[PDB]
Amino acid sequence: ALDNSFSPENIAQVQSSIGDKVTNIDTKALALNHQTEEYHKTSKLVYPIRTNLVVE
Amino acid sequence: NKQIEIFIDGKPAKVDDSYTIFQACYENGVIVPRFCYHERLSVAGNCRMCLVEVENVPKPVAACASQVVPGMKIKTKSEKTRIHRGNVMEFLLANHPLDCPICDQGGECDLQDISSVYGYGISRYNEYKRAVEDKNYGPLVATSMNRCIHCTRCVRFATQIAGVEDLGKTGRGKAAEIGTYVEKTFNTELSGNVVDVCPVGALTNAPYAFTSRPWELKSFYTSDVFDTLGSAIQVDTRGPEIMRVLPRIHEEINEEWIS
Amino acid sequence: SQRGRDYTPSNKKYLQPWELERKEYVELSLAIQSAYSCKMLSEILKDNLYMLTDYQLSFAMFHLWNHEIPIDNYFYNVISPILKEYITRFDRECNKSLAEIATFLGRMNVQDDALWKVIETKLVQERLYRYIPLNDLIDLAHGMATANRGSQEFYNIVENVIIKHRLRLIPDKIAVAKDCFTARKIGSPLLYQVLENPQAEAHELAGLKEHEQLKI
Amino acid sequence: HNIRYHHEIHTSDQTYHSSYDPVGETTTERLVRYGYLNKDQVNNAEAVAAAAKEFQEKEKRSPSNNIIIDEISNSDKPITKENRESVAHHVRQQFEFFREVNAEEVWSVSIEE
Amino acid sequence: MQNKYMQPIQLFIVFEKLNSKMWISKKLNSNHSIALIPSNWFYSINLFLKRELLFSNITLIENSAIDTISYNLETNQNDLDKTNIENYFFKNKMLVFYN
Amino acid sequence: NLNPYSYEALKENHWLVSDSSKKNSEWTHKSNAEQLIAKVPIIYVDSNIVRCIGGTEINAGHPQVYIQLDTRKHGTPQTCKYCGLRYAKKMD
Amino acid sequence: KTETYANYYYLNFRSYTGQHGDCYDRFLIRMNEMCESLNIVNQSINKISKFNNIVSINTKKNILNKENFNRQTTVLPHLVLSYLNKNDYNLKNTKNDYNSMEELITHFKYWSKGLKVESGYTYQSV
Amino acid sequence: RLAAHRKNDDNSDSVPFEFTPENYKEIEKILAKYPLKQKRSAVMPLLYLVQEQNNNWVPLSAMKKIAKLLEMPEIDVYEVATFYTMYNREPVGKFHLQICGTTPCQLCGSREITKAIEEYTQTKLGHTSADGKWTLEEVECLGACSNAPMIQVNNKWVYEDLTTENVVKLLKDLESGTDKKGPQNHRNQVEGPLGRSTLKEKDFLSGEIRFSRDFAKAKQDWVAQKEQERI
Amino acid sequence: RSYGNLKDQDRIFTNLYRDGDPFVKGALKRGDWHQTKEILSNGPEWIIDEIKKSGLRGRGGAGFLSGLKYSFMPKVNPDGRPSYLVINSDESEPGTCKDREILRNDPHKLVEGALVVGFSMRARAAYIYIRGEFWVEANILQQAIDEAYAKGFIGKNACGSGYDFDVYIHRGAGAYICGEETGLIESIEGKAGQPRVKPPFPANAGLYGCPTTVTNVETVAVCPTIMRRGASWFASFGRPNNAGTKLYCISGHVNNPCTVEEEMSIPLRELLEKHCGGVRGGWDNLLAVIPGGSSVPMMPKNVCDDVLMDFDALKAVGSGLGTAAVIVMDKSTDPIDAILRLSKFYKHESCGQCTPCREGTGWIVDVMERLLVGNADYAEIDMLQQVTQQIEMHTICALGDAAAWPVQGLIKNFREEIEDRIDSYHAKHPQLKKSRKSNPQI
């Protein structure tokens, strides 16, 4: 709901008000990422791309 | 003295010696962007959108504030005039709140009209905008001081047209308040003219607030029966429902103001 | 287009894209991008001399580098004079164009003594390298090293700037700069340590205070 | 930070209009149509000269010149029915223009192909 | 417009009775010219175009009418010229354009 | 608590009759979004001017709007003109 | 030349014309058009492709990056526009209607009344 | 600060504001400066008197009374009050300390002096102290740019030559109420330190500076020159 | 010649060092109220001619012809409308203190000058608009005015010459905008000091609708002394078109800040070294010099080495004489900080009557704040220069153009230092992705 420009306690209170427990609402991390311009979270596909079989 | 001769964009034109440059332009069908000068209100240099480049002149001259000089050549279509108008528009757009989707002026705002026509095209002031809280003046005048450009239109109209003295410029710098000093309502039997006088979405019809946009209103010109004068008006409607009414320019009945 | 129009630049030093019709600029860019012969490119540039642009010249150089188009006697005779005139017409707002031209000429191993002298004078005497990005400066140095056409003064200035911009070194640009330096064997122990770890603290890096004592 | 040149200054909006009076219209007929020569006051040398002078001075064009406007090409040679040599020149110009236009094709026209 | 272009004045030369009015603009291509013609010598013009060398190799591309009764210049009214298709349409009631 | 259509109520809720239960709006607007947003608390802000976009990034919410937290009366919160969030002064 | 619209004026493509004007001729025209369209599409894709990369002076191994879309994909759809129209490219990539009031006015006008068009009659064929 | 009247009960309409008889008597001379047709031209003297006699805080009731006296709109009176920075619409501290923050003051070290003063009072520059004795503010160029650094107290008796120890001593004196107005150093008012190179000769300063001129002869010469130019 | 050395013999402001009583006693000791009736008997035409022949240039902002400005006043109003003579003793421009020194040291000379100006313009009334910051100066001036009125030089009978002269002292406020002419007239009328339309001529329509002529305090001060001495005496103290002396006020990073009177066209280096002991740390340590008010752009070291304190010389150097306020900044001052402070002062001084001026001042303040930290680019300098150019000549008064000139001068002079600071900030802070949101609030 709120951007990085918001205060840490206010951000946590807003996250708790909407009953949010899935998104990261840590006050320490919110203070550490104050006014950040990271691109996004990224995943890494690891070669080779093969089907994950359940064989026993 | 009786018929001076000017050159508007290289076109010779015989005009009156007492008329303004904006008067000559409007008479010759030349549309000049403007935001403060009203033909029925006091002439002021509050806006700079009328600053026009004239041949053999050092700086742009407010056409609404500047009269016609004999033999003057006004190059309204010149690149210098275009650059000056763009600079003025960019300066004006510096602190205008991004409220067009949430302002009743959308679709009929002289601000956006000048921006699309006489504007630069893009914005370059990447900083936090100043903000001023709106006022409370009753259910007739809807106040949005954030978009109030301090055009002094409300003050001039109240002092000169309505005659009431409740509007004035408070403060200085970039935080001048376009509103009353104390908290009160504006009840002077011409509150509907305050919304029609604000060049921006600062003053709007609260009963008609968020009703619709001009793109969905059908206007028909008629005459009122509520007052014994029967001043001409235009009623805008949407389908079977009548939306609102606005004054019509009738100098023989009520000029351009209604009760 | 040209009828009732003057192709004279407004700035009297370089013609910006705002002075010409967009259709003409687009057509010139497409023609430059579709020039598959050295003689054809020379003819296109000469014919479009009245409306030529620095961005268009940079794009032509980039296309010549990407397509590996051979530089022939036509390039040495016709392209060289126009390129020299454009370089003499450059300015501080021509940082991207000048850097791209230098990098492309170096990467393509272009052998033009007069053009190289003009480029060196513009880069060093005018000291416009401050408007060249650190990664862009490293790429330009790598290009100059590819043809081995570069001044040792510019190399030292580039090394000092690289030492200055230790926090902005990406791994790819770092590897490119390391190749550029080791290929020409031009560098310092401080530059080599920065190549080993650019974002490292001031303890591991030796001579950092002395290097920072001299600005730029 | 360069917001001055977002709006294009030059656009391909140039328009030219070329006006030519009737080719068969005689110089005396042209003066009569323009009002410089009276319909009845014809075949008089002095009146014809006066009408021609008035047409030349007022309209800034020769009464024997059929080109009113030539903004498309700015040509000066009018084509008149009396001007057989000018008609021949126009025919030659049309043939040369046809040849040049058909010779400017990249893939449309190819004699060798 | 860097190609060879010339007004088809041969139409008025053959007609020898119609005041030719031609217009060329950069809004259309470099080979597009628009001319007003009287309806009286309309079939004659069509036949002359259909059966004349340097013009017989022609094909009708399109044909459309414009209800010039209510076509009115919305904006930039003062910018109208004295040789404008807009003024010509404002003068007449309909305009049939055959390309 | 105060009866609707009163002068005090009109002065308070900008000449409008505020609905406390929010069911009147949930029927008139066909959505309980009014009460859902009313479930939010009041936020105290240190700065006298705030930038609200209804989200986390530009174009990730509503257009940025500047709200003046410093008014004539201390501690008067302001709801966003773009989102349902309301912000107030940190102390006064 | 007087009718080329977007990109055929500078690219080489082969067009086939029939010598009979029959149904088989039309079918052959369609098939050859499909083949030449595939070829022209490949050429156009290559025109916006970065076929060359900086090669190391030491030895000749290409200096391939490790964290670059260029290393991942040889095609750069933004390279030409970024190099030739960097001002417009930056203006578009930086400012938005959610951030620029002028851009907000542009979005409003384009979505409510639309951009005004000058009076005139034109005919464009594709 | 706030261009609109803040919702403070201290400046509410219920505040009792009546001008003193001396202020009423003083109004006789002030009104004579401007024509009777324009009595609003005395609004500046009226506001000055109000600020003098109302603890450097102009009440809204005082503004209303001034508007009643001036026969001018109350909105106009409020606008005139807010347009100027020399008027305080709210109750300020006993010492409205003003420090010049302009470049001429900052070059002489106005920032260090302000920091020392704030350390003395333990109050922010933009706020007022809890004790209610002083209120700091970074004022603009007070006309003492040449004698910078310069401070002022209650818009009168501006002090100059503001050093660290000098400012500490001046603040202690202000607490004691006996401070050397103007510069607290050896500079002779505008004659700054390091000597005096202007008018070092004093005999001519005491020479009665009597310059005579026979204006009738000069006027006759001017008229004769005009006649000659005409001829 | 080699100007810049004027002795005490021809000095008008003899009590500049506060060497005498500013009251009527020291005034008559300083030559005040001497031959005033005879000088007035020459007539308004003769007085105006003498002022013009003295080569008097406007001592305030512009340096325009004071004689021409005074002669532009109407001889007689056909409708009986009065006349007003305004003396602008409200100098809020940073760097200047000459008016502040004059008010507290030479009170009656300005009174005699205002009386002479009113006689020349047939004005029955004069208003000395004294700065609200000059409180004690205003009190001293009021005492001197009362003494002069009791002396018979002003009032119903001004020195017994059959010309009633009334004088008022206006205690203003902190309004550099009211420091202007039209803003001063507006504040005198009892409203906000926003400048009026231009040209509405104040000579054609000034204060209270009556014609009003506004002049600087220093310009009006020399009116009686110059008339007594002769036009040649004040016209042989400077270069052509720059006639008269000037009370240059020098401060900043100088060794001995002060304010002294000297002949016009004084060499910059000579006047700096002789009158103040040079720049603290010598001529080598000096980095910049503003030769006028905050409006005047800062000058470079080479220009300061080779320049003269004249209007034409300053214009040739790109600066302006203006108020002749000599602000000296040494090598230890960050020019960006001074620019930001001047921006804050000017934006707190623009009346905002012009949206262009107000918005430009705010954006320039924001850009100055962002530039010091380095969170900007080289293109930001170009954008700031473009904004400053756009603000110029497009405002109501000269205030909107005043703030842009210092920024333009700083940009033209200190490109390398700003670039180095930006480089340091950027190498100290790398960020590939720039946030699409506006600049973070300061």
Ligand SMILES: Cc1cc2nc3c(=O)[nH]c(=O)nc-3n(C[C@H](O)[C@H](O)[C@H](O)COP(=O)(O)O)c2cc1C
């Ligand atoms: C914002 C602003 C401030 C001004 N401040 C002063 C000032 O302090 N002193 C002054 O003499 N003129 C000042 N002026 C100039 C006046 O408007 C007026 O032109 C001038 O006082 C005329 O005096 P002069 O002809 O002797 O220079 C200022 C102008 C502006 C626009």
Ligand code: SF4
């Ligand atoms: S007044 Fe309203 S509609 Fe007009 S530009 Fe401002 S925010 Fe947009």
Ligand code: SF4
């Ligand atoms: S509120 Fe509106 S009418 Fe009043 S001054 Fe502001 S812009 Fe003008």
Ligand code: SF4
């Ligand atoms: S220039 Fe500035 S101070 Fe002067 S009138 Fe205009 S907005 Fe006000």
Ligand code: FES
């Ligand atoms: S609208 Fe014309 S000067 Fe203001």
Ligand code: FES
């Ligand atoms: S800057 Fe210090 S009082 Fe002027």
Ligand SMILES: [Zn+2]
């Ligand atoms: Zn929101």
